[PDB]
Design a protein around this ligand. Sequence first.
Ligand SMILES: [K+]
Ligand SMILES: [K+]
Ligand SMILES: [K+]
Ligand SMILES: [K+]
Ligand SMILES: [Mg+2]
Ligand SMILES: [Mg+2]
Ligand SMILES: [Mg+2]
Ligand SMILES: [Mg+2]
Lengths: 494, 494, 494, 494
Amino acid sequence: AGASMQSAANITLRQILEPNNVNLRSKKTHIVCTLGPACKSVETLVKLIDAGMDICRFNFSHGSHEDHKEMFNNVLKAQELRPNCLLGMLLDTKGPEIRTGFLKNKEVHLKEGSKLKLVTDYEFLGDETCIACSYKKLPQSVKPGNIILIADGSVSCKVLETHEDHVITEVLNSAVIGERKNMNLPNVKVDLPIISEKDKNDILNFAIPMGCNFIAASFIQSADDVRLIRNLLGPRGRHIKIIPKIENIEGIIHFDKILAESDGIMIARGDLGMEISPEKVFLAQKLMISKCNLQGKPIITATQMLESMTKNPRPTRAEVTDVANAVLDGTDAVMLSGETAGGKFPVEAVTIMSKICLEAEACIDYKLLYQSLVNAIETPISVQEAVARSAVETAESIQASLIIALTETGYTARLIAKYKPSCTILALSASDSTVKCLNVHRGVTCIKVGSFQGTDIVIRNAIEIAKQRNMAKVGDSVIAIHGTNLMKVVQIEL
Amino acid sequence: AGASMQSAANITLRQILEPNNVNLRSKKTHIVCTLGPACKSVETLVKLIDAGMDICRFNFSHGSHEDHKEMFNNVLKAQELRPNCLLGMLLDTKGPEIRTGFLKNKEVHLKEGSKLKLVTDYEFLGDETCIACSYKKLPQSVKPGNIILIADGSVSCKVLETHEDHVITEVLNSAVIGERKNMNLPNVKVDLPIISEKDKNDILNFAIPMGCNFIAASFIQSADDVRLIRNLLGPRGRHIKIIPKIENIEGIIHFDKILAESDGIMIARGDLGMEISPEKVFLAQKLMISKCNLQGKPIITATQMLESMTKNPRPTRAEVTDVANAVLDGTDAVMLSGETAGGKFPVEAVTIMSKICLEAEACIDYKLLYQSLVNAIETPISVQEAVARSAVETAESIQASLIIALTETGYTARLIAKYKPSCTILALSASDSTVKCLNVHRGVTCIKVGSFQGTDIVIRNAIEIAKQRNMAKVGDSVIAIHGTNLMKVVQIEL
Amino acid sequence: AGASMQSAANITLRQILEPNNVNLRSKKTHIVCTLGPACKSVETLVKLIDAGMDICRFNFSHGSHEDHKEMFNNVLKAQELRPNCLLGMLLDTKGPEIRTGFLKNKEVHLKEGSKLKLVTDYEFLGDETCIACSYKKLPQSVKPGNIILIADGSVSCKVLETHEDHVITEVLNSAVIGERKNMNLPNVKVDLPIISEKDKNDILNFAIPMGCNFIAASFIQSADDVRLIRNLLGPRGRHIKIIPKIENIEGIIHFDKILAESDGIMIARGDLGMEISPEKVFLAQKLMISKCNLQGKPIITATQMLESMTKNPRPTRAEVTDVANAVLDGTDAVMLSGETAGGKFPVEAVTIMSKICLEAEACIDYKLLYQSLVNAIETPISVQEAVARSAVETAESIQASLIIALTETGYTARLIAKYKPSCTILALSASDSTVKCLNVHRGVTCIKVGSFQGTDIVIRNAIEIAKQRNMAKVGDSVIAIHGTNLMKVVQIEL
Amino acid sequence: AGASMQSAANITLRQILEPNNVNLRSKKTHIVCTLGPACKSVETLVKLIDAGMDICRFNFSHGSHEDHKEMFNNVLKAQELRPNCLLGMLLDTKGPEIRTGFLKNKEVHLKEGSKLKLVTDYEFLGDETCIACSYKKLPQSVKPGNIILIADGSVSCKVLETHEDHVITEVLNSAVIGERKNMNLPNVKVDLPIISEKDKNDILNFAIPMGCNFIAASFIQSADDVRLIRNLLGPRGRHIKIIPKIENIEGIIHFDKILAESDGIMIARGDLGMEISPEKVFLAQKLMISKCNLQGKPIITATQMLESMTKNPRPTRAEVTDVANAVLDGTDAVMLSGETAGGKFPVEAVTIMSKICLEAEACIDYKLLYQSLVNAIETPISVQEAVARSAVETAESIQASLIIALTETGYTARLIAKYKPSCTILALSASDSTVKCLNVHRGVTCIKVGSFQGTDIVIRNAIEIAKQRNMAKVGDSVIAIHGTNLMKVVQIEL
Ligand SMILES: [K+]
Ligand SMILES: [K+]
Ligand SMILES: [K+]
Ligand SMILES: [K+]
Ligand SMILES: [Mg+2]
Ligand SMILES: [Mg+2]
Ligand SMILES: [Mg+2]
Ligand SMILES: [Mg+2]
């Protein structure tokens, strides 16, 4: 049904024993950092940039437009102090949610085997036998036998009866829960608007005006959800990328069609764990990464890969291996949530995440990775894809230090990134939109250039900038690709 | 320097969405469970067997010979209630340790930048400026610039001075520590006996008399350490397998020679994390698994892969992915420590571990895995290896349900397991030692048979036992291999 | 439409410079020799056996049943002098023929551009403007524009008119021809019985009574032709193999269906050259060899590969290369016609043919050849094919000197030969039919054994015979395969 | 010792049944035609050009400088009538020869077993017991046991005695020979000057003045022979290519070093057959073709591949297959000698040779051929080779109709030809030397362009010329490569 994947690594004793001492921003994997009070200051945001931050996430499930505007402006000023780092701006929509009601004593201890009524009258003050639910269509969506999760899966309930204004369930495990806790409906499609009037306001009155580059759309369940957001963005938001968040079984079932309409994918594994069995989540991650890789669509592994670091100064061993294997799987980007938003060690979390990515990236056998991609991609490829293929190929053969890609819309750099070169892709664009959207692709670093300039002049300017940024040196070869379509090798001299 | 590895997986939508409902003991990956008070009862040990326990670990860092004998006898009685499950018995040696001394007020808050003396006089009651160390040769082993870790890496110290009876260090980070905390000497060889007089007693007076099958030797640093334990076991312990625990940089540096002398490997990743950078541990794991796979030597990934479950009823997402990726890496076995020894959810930990292994095992593309092994193994292979190769190959081609291997010493089943068949290997042996040592190899299940029986009679008896245990059914093909060397295909009828 | 093929060779300087001095009968490629007056004596037939003759062809286009019976009995007596050489007996049917009529002056010089009438009245004495044709249905089979070839293609004629009892053609090239010359109808199906009453007599009253092993059926044009001969053979000729001769475009068009009904194929390239363009014949040869190889059906490249040697003591360079490339293509057998039937150097022709085959056989990269076969054969294979696969594989891995195959019907040896082992296949059979039919398969040498003997006793007897015949020596490994299905490796000792 | 080779073909029913009707000059394989009285007229030479002639061979073993000058000027006038065909001019040196002396009665019948004296006094009139030999160093080069061939191998002689001025041999086979017949010394190095004073005159006073492009040096035995001819050519002949003719065992033994100094290779198989066993010649051909292919050095298969056509209007079947397999082996060019020099069907011979090449070329699986080359070429490749690789690769991926290569010296077109693209290579050069030397490379067609022209202007002019010559059409893609190094794809419009 899904797809197959082939990883290839070369691990030396030297890489295990000798410390890595390269610049953290030289990594190919990009880091999405969630903004919050822990990194509210321009001082902390600059430290996050130096640590490896590439995309700032604005979580619009919390905070007002004011709260995100003082954060946005502080990021732009951190941006001014770090001009060689063009950060992508990502808005994460609140999206549809399901929550329990209020309780008379603010606490209930649901006991296993007992029966619990879930009513649609949200004004009802609940008790251990009956609790309100904010999702009015709940009785029409669940059937007898369906499982209902409450409070981050703290308690499961097997649906016994469905009625017009309530359902009756059996508490499957004993646990104590509180007020207004979240709910999940595994294997059931939630019939709530993908974009609420509040979500509509954040998109049209924040994302578009403030110039956000990505909309991470929470709880995408169909291609129609994506097309709705595309139409809502309209010509005003033509350049804003839509990144569906796969969070439930519906998104998995319709993933292929969702991906075809998308500009990229975010795997919300924590939320996914509340909809599928814990032992199945790694199956969904690796399948989604593989499908995105073969389409050339970027993918973010999310949302809290160093979760313990938001209290601890060092991650757990499992969190470290999880980051490394996500890179080896082929993820374009990795994400931090509470670690940077409200935690005690935000800079420490981004720092170690960058170091893990660099170690995993040095593992990859790029020739084997390249052939795995070529062997699995559909045979008829366009001229543009063939030339991008030849750039990656030629770069590996001559050990070029850089692939320089001239691109207005980003399409050329995306085609190159699809084939995963071992060297950095330096994309040059006159579009301020393009230079901030390519951040989501692995291995792409952008430079803004002026318009109406000849190709030869732009390339020589990029070579000089690359020399200053230590991205290339005298004696190196670099690839230039632009256009009809053209691939060029130039050696750096003088 | 090291080696390369190639994983291959096929992930369908059905495997993500449809629940797995096979017997937990049908998995190929085997589980090492650490015994302790949480599973002291025969009632709990039987539940662990049903959950997926294959090897019981006796941690001899704690408890006396009495403490392990009441546990051993309780395991033998759980064994009697589960006759179709032949558990391996593993003794984990205490091995060399390094600990700080005692303190006047039982607590010190070492401050960053301050200086700390480490003395070899263990009777000295320490303070924040001077603390004893149990390793007398410490000043002769560390040099200026070496890093000294204390209390599970809670504080690092840079060595400033070395003298005959003490060293002087600079506290690199502020932290509060207590009495008798462990110490680690990254990148330095610890000159302590691999086997103490206490370790010698546990081997010769417990492991050999009680019939332990494996010695997990803590802190192996050289092939000479392995040969010492081999000579100490002598003819009395000829059938006991030596499993070195790789725990520091010395074990990594000399891993190839250590492996050549070993019967298998245990990756002690938690202890390894106190000797190498956290971002390097996954490099060592994947390299060691790959080297063991290509030698046909079994490897245990260890020691606490579901660490949070020893307090929580469900593991973290990172712990689940860590187990799954260790299986995909090619580990023969996975290990639980505190989760089963003293935790609250021992049976729950083994249960989910088995489920994760089954999901990862269903991912593997076994044909691609087979060719990866054949392409990387040295070309001149013996007759015995070629016939074992042909059994795995033939089984995959005809979709055989079982490979039946007749083996006195286990060598034939080990050769087959080296090539990772997609079907179970049913090893038949008259040796009670052999049927309990093959547990450490992935995919091998053993049956004890009587001696002095013809090959045809033993095979037909195994087929009948396999039918009863639901390992094979009418219409299936099974492979039989024995011997000169013979490969046979038989169909199950009637 | 057709198929693809992949040859692989390893050519050393030593093989070019150092002479080959192995026994000519050790070659894998088998030689079909056409019997005639040049090899009528038992003395010459024994020399042909020593030179490399494996199959004797009785051309029934010429000679009576007496003429072939004195030859047959002389072959049986040569057989008695060479007991370690079991020759196959092949009857080549006369089959349908088309010939011109008689001429008034026995010679006509047809001039280009002139017009020539071909009448169906065979009694008409012809001239340069009108000549009879033995094929009465000629006007119903050719259309205007069709080409008619006369006297081994000495003159072509473009059909201008068709009428009930004649056709009118334009002579396309000037040439002089004689009486009763053969004719060919390129791209037209000849509507003549595949088996005449004379052909029926040779099959039922010679081939079946004398015990012929193969019927090479001239001018097979459809699967129905093969089934007709199969029904004509009936239970009396159940064990006689049908080898269709592909001689025209109809046989090429319907080759797949003809092959499915056949026991093998003979490429009659000389006759094929009179039906297709000369530059297309090598296309048909390589395609037919490749299709037969992938079906496991034997193929003979024919009919006169050393044609010049029937006058010259040494072949031309092109004839030598043609034999070598046919072997590299993958032909099971090669054929001599006039070189042995009536030529001056019959023994010299078979001798050099054997030497060429040995040189080409030493070129082949057998591992690459094996994988080419495995990669192109349909994935679901039976148990019997998988075990035969494993025998070839195991033999190559351990460098076994022999694959010993116990087979009643020959099926087991055919399955092994399909995978082209680098070592000889020694087939043991109690069937005198089987031991003389397997001659057509490359690399198979047969030994007749007594019935009602245990498998172990037969194998040990074959090993002892192989040692005497220098086919194997002390220290070698050999493979034995029989059966349910069994693969066994035994080492030769003592 | 030597090398390995992998051919890959795809043969359809359509290619066997449907006639090919493309232009004979569109073939990739190039034809060397030997000039002589049969093609002395400008009228015949133009017919040879239309039939597929690409290189004219001037055999300087016969004829004077006058005889070759009237032929040369007639070729230049045929060249003027066919401006879109730039013929290469090849001089074949007489080189060292060995001939018997004169005879009293002009005929001797040497009898097997008899003894024959070979004297160095060339004035001696010979008889059946003693015959002169033109090679004075003969007794110093042969030893007892060496074989001496006389009159195209009509009789062999085993050396019995060597003395200062004669040798004594035993006639090994009975045969009648005449006066001044050639001689061959298998497995012995002939100590004669590679370039005689007569050969020196043909090079310096014909080849260089008349502008010959290739020197086919007869009987090259060492790299020193090649360097001698290179020094003799000097700066005046810097642009003349040296093509050693491999004719004996010395040339085979030292082939690698000879090839490294050469610009190409000619396999003189007929002369080679007089030095090695007939069954070994195809081994030498395939090994030499494979080594030349992997070096990117062109190779001519020679000298008389349609030998029978010099009397017959149609070649033998073996001659047709020999041409086809030489193309499939990977030969750059094929050669005719007597067929065009003095035969009755010169135009008919070139015509069918072109048709065979086109059929074999349509067989080739070019992707598999490309990967076979990439997998076997040494891993570190230059920038220039990588870009040429990418041009061939890109052309195959997008099905480009042409690779346009701008090249001054021909090096760029040679690098492309090394990787065997399925489409024609159109090389553009201002050098009249370069446009006539690239003829020897498979698939390269040259166009002379003016100097001091921009790259973009030259490319557009080539596209327009390609459209007129029907080499490309509207809608096609073509590759352009020049330079630093540049690969460009352009689509043909309007
Ligand atoms: K959100
Ligand atoms: K321990
Ligand atoms: K016949
Ligand atoms: K010559
Ligand atoms: Mg959510
Ligand atoms: Mg430890
Ligand atoms: Mg015929
Ligand atoms: Mg010569």
